[PDB]
Every structure is written in structure tokens, then in C-alpha cells.
Amino acid sequence: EITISSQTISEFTHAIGNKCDAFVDRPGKATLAPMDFAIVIGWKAIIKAIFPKSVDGDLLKLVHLSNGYKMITGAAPLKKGDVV
Amino acid sequence: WSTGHSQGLVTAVTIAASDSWDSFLKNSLTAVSLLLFIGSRCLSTYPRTSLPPTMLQDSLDNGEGRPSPMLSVRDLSIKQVEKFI
Amino acid sequence: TSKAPGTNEPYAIVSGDYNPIHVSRVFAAYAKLPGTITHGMYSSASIRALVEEWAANNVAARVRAFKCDFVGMVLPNDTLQTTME
């Protein structure tokens, strides 16, 4: 369980240069989180799947080929109060 | 007498505090360090975010400027600009 | 256009992507890949921030799906020109 704090968003958007005003904290609007913050939430769940013994490879020659995001139809984007 | 505008008022109070060549540097360093705090904290409080490219391309085509948090209105009285805001 | 970072160390400590290919001189030279290449997840978030403002008119709720193939590698400070169709 990671809690999306306000500091974790602004450090993330500064690291990626996302200028968009929905991600910076403004009064009169719920501070929205990036959709690329999915991989920050879910990294330790994804790359644990290449550690099992039945998938046995030279990990130092690993090439990250493709990644994709998909919002579930009817789901709201991430906020700064969300326990995720 | 002397005075400053929006920013340079700190250089006007620099100007009356400085006397010699040594005193002028000591008051100028307190001026340029002061506007590093006016500089940083006015961006840390109101961070400029990205602008929709429909907006700024409209603003360049209408003869206006690239959008920014301050807008200059010429040729109108103060009583009628506040009728528009 | 967009431009690569100078170093891969800010994105690694944020996202937890501590792969030493991206940050270390010796791990990147070990696997015979052309240097301390950029994170793929930076090029995910950089190009997605391009399509979020230049295709969705800077409305953050509109983009609902985004996928990419990391077909090539990019060295830091390289200048990336993208197309959008």
C-alpha cells in the first residue's frame, strides 16, 4: 500500500517535466496525479515476475521492450488522498 | 528623492542606504539576496504550469502576446476596466 | 521536440528504477550498450506529456490509454522530435 502524497507527485512531475496544471497543487481543484505514476506504484509488483526460477535468464541483458497503460472504463484518475 | 516600480523599489532603498564604496556593496548584497527570495518563493507558491496550445496560438493570431500571469490594458480608464473584470 | 535529461539519477530515485545500466559507467559498458542510456519510463512519461497537451489540449482527464514500444535507445541530452497522428 502506497499513499499518494502531495510531495511524491511534485517530485515526479519535476523529474519528468510534466508542466500540466492538473498535477500541481492549486486551491479550488483536487490535485491530480500522473497516469505514469502507475509504474511508480506498481514497479515492485511487475519486476518481481522476472525473478522466479522457471524464468531463468541473464538479467543483465534484459531489454525493456514495451509498456502500456489502460484506464478501466468508469475509473477516476489518481488523487492525493488515495490509498493505493 | 527616488522611487522604484514593481521590482526596482529595493534598489531605491539600496540607493539611500549606500554611502561609500564599501557600504554600497554591503547594501547591494542585501538587495540581490533579497530578490532571490522574492524570485524563488513567488515561483514556489504559484508555479507556472503548461498552457493549452489552442490558447497561446489563438493569442498570437489575435495580435496579443504569449500568455503570462500579468496583462497590460492600454487606452481604457480605470473605471471601465473594472467594469470588465 | 523534446530533449533527454542530462543524467538518469533524478528519475531513478523517484520511480525506484535503480537499474545500474542507466546510471553507472561500468554496468552500461559491461552489457555493451552505448552508455548510460535513458530510462524507458522517462520516454514513456515525456512523450505522454507531449500528447496530453498537444493532442488533448492540455486537459489531463482526456488521455485514457497510452502504450509505446521501446524500439531504440537514447543517450542523455539527445534531442527527440516526435510526430503525432
Greatest CA separation found in chain B? 54
Are C12 and C22 in contact, with CB atoms under 8 Å apart? yes
Are A43 and C13 in contact, with CB atoms under 8 Å apart? no
Cα(B56)–Cα(C58) distance, rounded to whole angstroms?
12
C65-69 and A66-70 beta bridge pairing: antiparallel
Cα(C46)–Cα(A20) distance, rounded to whole angstroms?
12
Count other C-beta atoms under 10 Å from residue A65's C-beta. Answer: 10
Which residue has cell 510531495?
A7
Residue of B nearest to A21 (CA): B49
* Solving technique: cryo-EM
Coil, helix or strand at residue C45? helix
- Experimental resolution (Å): 2.8
Which residues touch A56 (CB under 8 Å, ≥6 apart)?
none
Coil, helix or strand at residue B15? helix
Residue of A nearest to C10 (CA): A15
What is the end-to-end Cα distance of chain B in Å, rounded?
35
Are A24 and A10 in contact, with CB atoms under 8 Å apart? yes
Coil, helix or strand at residue C4? coil
Are A20 and C58 in contact, with CB atoms under 8 Å apart? yes
Cα(C68)–Cα(C8) distance, rounded to whole angstroms?
20
Q: Is A21 on the interface with B (CB under 8 A)?
A: yes
| Angle, CA A36 vertex, CA A33 and CA A37 arms, to 5° | 55
B18 assigned to active site: no
A39/C41 touch (CB, cutoff 8 Å), yes or no:
yes
The DSSP secondary structure of A23-76, one letter per residue, reads: SS--TTSPPBPPGGGHHHHSHHHHGGGS-STTS---GGG----EEEEE--TT-P
Count other C-beta atoms under 10 Å from residue B56's C-beta. Answer: 14
Q: What is the distance in angstroms between the Cα of C51 and the nearest Cα belonging to chain A?
A: 11
C79-80 and A66-70 beta bridge pairing: unpaired
Calculate helix-pair angle for B21-32, B34-45, nearest 10 degrees.
Answer: 10
Cα(A7)–Cα(A15) distance, rounded to whole angstroms?
12
Ramachandran region, residue A13 (left: φ > 0; alpha: ψ -120 to 50; beta: rest): alpha
Residue of B nearest to C52 (CA): B52
Which residues touch B69 (CB under 8 Å, ≥6 apart)?
B46, B48
Cα(C10)–Cα(C39) distance, rounded to whole angstroms?
11
Are C28 and C36 in contact, with CB atoms under 8 Å apart? yes
Residue C7 phi/psi, 5-degree rounding, is -140, 155
Residue A83 phi/psi, 5-degree rounding, is -95, 110
Pick among A7, A14, A24 to test the B interface (most B CBs inside 10 A): A24
C30/A60 touch (CB, cutoff 8 Å), yes or no:
yes
Are A77 and A32 in contact, with CB atoms under 8 Å apart? yes
Cα(C24)–Cα(C46) distance, rounded to whole angstroms?
22
Give residue B71's identity as a one-letter amino acid code. L
Cα(B26)–Cα(B18) distance, rounded to whole angstroms?
8
Which residues touch C15 (CB under 8 Å, ≥6 apart)?
A12, A15, A39, A40, A43, C39, C41
A36/C48 touch (CB, cutoff 8 Å), yes or no:
yes
B50/A18 touch (CB, cutoff 8 Å), yes or no:
yes
Q: Is C26 on the interface with A (CB under 8 A)?
A: no
Coil, helix or strand at residue A20? strand
Touching subunits of A (3+ CB pairs, under 8 Å) are B, C
Q: What is the distance in angstroms between the Cα of C68 and the nearest Cα belonging to chain B?
A: 23
Burial status of residue A12 (CB atoms within 10 A of its CB: 0-12, 13-18, 19 or more): buried
Give residue C58's identity as a one-letter amino acid code. N
Cα(A46)–Cα(B81) distance, rounded to whole angstroms?
57
